[PDB]
């Protein structure tokens, strides 16, 4: 009597969830802003 290697049931479908209708982050507009700071006064922006 041989105990074979364990199987797992195959997933029959995919569930994908995301919050709809969120705005674009505009990260490029902030990175391309020509008023660039020095390392002494490095700027932060938070995207959520």
């Amino acid at each position: 009597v041989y105990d074979l290697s364990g199987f797992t049931v195959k997933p029959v479908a995919t569930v994908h969830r995301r919050i709809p209708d969120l705005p674009d982050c505009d990260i490029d507009k902030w990175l391309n802003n020509f008023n660039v700071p020095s390392p002494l006064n490095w700027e932060r922006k938070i995207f959520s």
Partner: protein
């Protein structure tokens, strides 16, 4: 010994007493799938 005789307590009445004794002779037959335990469903782990 008082002369040739010794003092002894001899029973004048009795009963029967029961005593239980469990002796283990077996144990749960544990079996491990080493591959399923170590790596679960993950192909990248099964390779390593």
């Amino acid at each position: 010994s008082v002369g040739g005789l010794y003092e002894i307590k001899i029973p004048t009445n009795f009963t029967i007493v029961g005593q239980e004794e469990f002796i283990q002779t077996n144990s749960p037959k544990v079996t491990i799938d080493c591959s399923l335990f170590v790596c679960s469903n993950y192909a990248a782990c099964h390779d390593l």
